[PDB]
């Protein structure tokens, strides 16, 4: 029921490093996990991340391991996704999404997920 | 071995150090276990806390009994995590035991001798017997890199620890204290290293 | 020495002049104590008083257990403090028991026989023997600068104080009213000091 | 989390009086320790007192003993710092800090604090 | 008629600067001329400097001459004085006031002057 937006996005060199942020509107977000998607022109939207609702549970994509960090302040109920290693490719729309009303494990799939925010922009130059 | 019947750790402060390390003799992979420990701590109202760190060298998180913030009582086994909401929270010692099954992945959770609703959780998994144990810390690796704002502050005692399921009359056997026969963790036979600011003192709750 | 059993002094009307003096035959000086004692008042929706004061030469403050309005229990030794809060003050005569040790700072508290979690204070800290108790008024000087809004009005009684840190089933005998053998300080076989309005009556609490 | 601010501060002949004040926003102020610290140009701050949290526990510096006076009221919310016998080095800004939501003694560090005030100045002729 | 309320007082190093402001409330103040005066304790008001309507026309005291600078805006309706490379003695309590429902000079006393502000203390070590 959460609604979400994002910010932080933009265009940086190579090398660089964004402090990506989520908001969420609503008073269950402590009950939905979080999850970081990209979506890139001529394609669909692709796993990132995804984060414990509790938070001391978190998942990460191969490419996204060892350089990419996600957290969560309950809080302040807003999600983190600290990403750095800025090269290229990793240049595409990206959209925080999140959809779980009950206790359950990180999933990597599309199908769960209910509910999407508008979507923020990352350029590596 | 040495006899802590009666007894109990003290963690009188907040702090990043202080932390008891436990031993088991398990060499076999675990299909099924359960877990029953009394603790009893004030930071319920304030912040989260680990109860119970059991860790591999592959996942600091094989099983992991933790409390989280205005949530409740949050299991975890082999990277996946279940809660187990609480509405209110009153200042009381507390019993738990905590069971979990892998051909089924049915887990069972007892608080003061009052079960939960049983769920699932990854069903056909195994856990490695190769692991480090430890009270008083939440451990993101195999020999470290603890947090302070997740150590707890108080006591814990009557861990003990099984590779198989108890029914539910052997748990409340347990609850109102008669005699059992541990087997992989025995609080009458245990084993342990502690660092840091940590005590034994004879016991709170009844 | 007098047998103050089954009977307790009384403080009609709040004032800056009544007040009970307690002599100690104390000379080796304490590392470690348990206080118990009983007191009755309906002053908690109210300002705040002192239950005990403990005051060598170099520090009014060694011991004062002391209520804290809106707070709770506030207790405090060699300068230091801790509080003990309370979420609502009911209306009965109320029974309590601290101890602290010198060697690991530990603190226990226990109100009306249930236990409060243990915390830390003053690691290595020593207390002097030669000293003036005062009951009824907090004293900010050795023996005088008796405060009015801090004076208590009401009852105290059983005031019992050992050098050294009793069981958990040592303080359920005392709560129960078992027999026992105070060191520092007997209630039956007390010697005091009266000032002012105060009066021996027998006890309301059971 | 409350939030600090003074008043009381101005210049003065040698040998007068001064009853600063400082002000607290929030609800959790009686849950914290008070204290005043010293600044002057060229250097950093300096502890000067502190106030305990029920109010019965105080703590002054060397030259503040017999001199200075430390209070608190919890109804309104607000610590007060009376001084005497003003000299003229003690002329500087001064600052009203304090952060242990939480229960302990009174220390003589900065570390432990957490929260400041804008600051005011005190200034002798 | 106009409320005057200065700011930018404080304490800093012999040979500092300081572009302390005033604040008028009313709608008159493109009509009165301003002024900025001093003040130590156990003396009276001393004459510092004073600021035109149409602010070309000014007059600064002997010591302040070239020191300092006087101005004024009526957009913001706000006066500013600026003083450069202080010293200890020009520490004292510094008043914005003035008063002119006429047309006149910019005089040097101070009866002619009516509404008076606060003042703010300004120190230099």
């Known amino acids: 029921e959460v609604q979400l937006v994002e910010s932080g996005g933009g265009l940086v060199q190579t090398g660089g490093s964004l402090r990506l942020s989520c908001?969420?509107?609503?008073?269950?977000?402590?009950?939905?996990?979080?999850?970081?998607f990209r979506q890139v022109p001529g394609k669909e939207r692709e796993f990132?991340?995804?984060?414990?609702?509790?938070?001391?549970?978190?998942?990460?994509?191969d490419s996204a391991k060892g350089r990419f960090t996600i957290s969560r302040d309950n809080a302040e109920n807003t999600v983190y996704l600290q990403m750095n290693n800025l090269k290229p490719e990793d240049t595409a729309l990206?959209?925080?999404?999140?959809?779980?009303?009950?206790?359950?494990?990180?999933?990597?799939?599309?199908?769960?997920?209910?509910?999407?925010?508008?979507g923020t922009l990352v350029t590596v130059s | 071995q040495t006899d802590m019947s009666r007894k109990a750790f003290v963690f009188p402060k907040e702090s990043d150090t202080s932390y008891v390390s436990l031993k088991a003799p398990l060499t076999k992979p675990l299909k099924a276990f359960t877990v029953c420990l009394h603790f009893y701590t004030e930071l319920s109202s304030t912040r989260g806390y680990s109860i119970f760190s059991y860790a591999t060298k592959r996942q600091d998180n094989e099983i992991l009994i933790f409390w989280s913030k205005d949530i409740g009582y949050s299991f975890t086994v082999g990277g996946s995590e279940i809660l187990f909401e609480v509405p209110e929270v009153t200042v009381a010692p507390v019993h738990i035991c905590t069971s979990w099954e892998s051909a089924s992945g049915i887990v069972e959770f007892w608080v003061d001798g009052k079960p939960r609703v049983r769920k699932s959780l990854k069903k056909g998994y195994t856990v490695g017997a190769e692991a480090s144990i430890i009270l008083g810390q939440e451990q993101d690796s195999f020999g470290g890199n603890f947090e302070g704002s997740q150590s707890l502050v108080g006591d814990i005692g009557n861990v003990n620890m099984w590779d198989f399921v108890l029914s539910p009359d052997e748990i409340n056997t347990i609850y109102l204290g008669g005699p059992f026969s541990p087997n992989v963790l025995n609080w009458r036979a245990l084993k342990y290293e502690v660092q840091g600011e940590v005590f034994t003192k004879p016991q709170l709750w009844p | 020495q007098t047998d103050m059993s089954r009977k307790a002094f009384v403080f009609p009307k709040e004032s800056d002049t009544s007040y009970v003096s307690l002599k100690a035959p104390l000379t080796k000086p304490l590392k470690a104590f348990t206080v118990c004692l009983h007191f009755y008042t309906e002053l908690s929706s109210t300002r705040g008083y002192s239950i005990f004061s403990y005051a060598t030469k170099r520090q009014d403050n060694e011991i004062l257990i002391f209520w804290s309005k809106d707070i709770g229990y506030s207790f405090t030794v060699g300068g230091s403090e801790i509080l003990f809060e309370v979420p609502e003050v009911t209306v009965a005569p109320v029974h309590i028991c601290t101890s602290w040790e010198s060697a690991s700072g530990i603190v226990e508290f226990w109100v009306d026989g249930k236990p409060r979690v243990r915390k830390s204070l003053k690691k290595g800290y020593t207390v002097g023997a030669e000293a003036s108790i005062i009951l009824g008024q907090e004293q900010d000087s050795f023996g005088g600068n008796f405060e009015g809004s801090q004076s208590l009005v009401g009852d105290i009684g059983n005031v019992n104080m050992w050098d050294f840190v009793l069981s958990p089933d040592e303080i359920n005998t005392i709560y129960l009213g078992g027999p026992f053998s105070p060191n520092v300080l007997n209630w039956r076989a007390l010697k005091y000091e009266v000032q002012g309005e105060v009066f021996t009556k027998p006890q309301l609490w059971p | 989390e409350v939030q600090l601010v003074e008043s009381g501060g101005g210049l003065v002949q040698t040998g007068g009086s001064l009853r600063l004040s400082c002000?607290?926003?929030?609800?959790?102020?009686?849950?914290?320790?008070?204290?005043?610290f010293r600044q002057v140009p060229g250097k950093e701050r300096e502890f000067?007192?502190?106030?305990?949290?029920?109010?019965?526990?105080?703590?002054?510096?060397d030259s503040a003993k017999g001199r200075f006076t430390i209070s608190r009221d919890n109804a309104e919310n607000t610590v007060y710092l009376q001084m005497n016998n003003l000299k003229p080095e003690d002329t500087a800004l001064?600052?009203?800090?304090?952060?242990?939501?939480?229960?302990?003694?009174?220390?003589?560090?900065?570390?432990?604090?957490?929260?400041?005030?804008?600051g005011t100045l005190v200034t002798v002729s | 008629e106009v409320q005057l309320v200065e700011s930018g007082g404080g304490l800093v190093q012999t040979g500092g600067s300081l572009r302390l402001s005033c604040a008028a409330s009313?709608?008159?103040?493109?009509?009165?001329?301003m002024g900025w005066f001093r003040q130590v304790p156990g003396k009276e008001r001393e004459f510092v400097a004073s600021?035109?309507?149409?602010?070309?026309?000014?007059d600064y005291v002997d010591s302040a001459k070239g020191r300092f600078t006087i101005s004024r805006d009526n957009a913001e309706n706000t006066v500013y004085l600026q003083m450069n490379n202080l010293k200890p003695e020009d520490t004292a309590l510094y008043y914005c006031?003035?008063?002119?429902?006429?047309?006149?000079?910019?005089?040097?006393?101070?009866?002619?002057?009516?509404?008076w502000g606060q003042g703010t203390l300004v120190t230099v070590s």
């Open positions: 006031a003035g008063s002119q429902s006429s047309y006149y000079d910019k005089p040097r006393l101070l009866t002619e002057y009516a509404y």
């Open positions: 009313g709608r008159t103040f493109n009509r009165h001329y």
């Open positions: 600021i035109s309507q149409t602010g070309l026309n000014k």
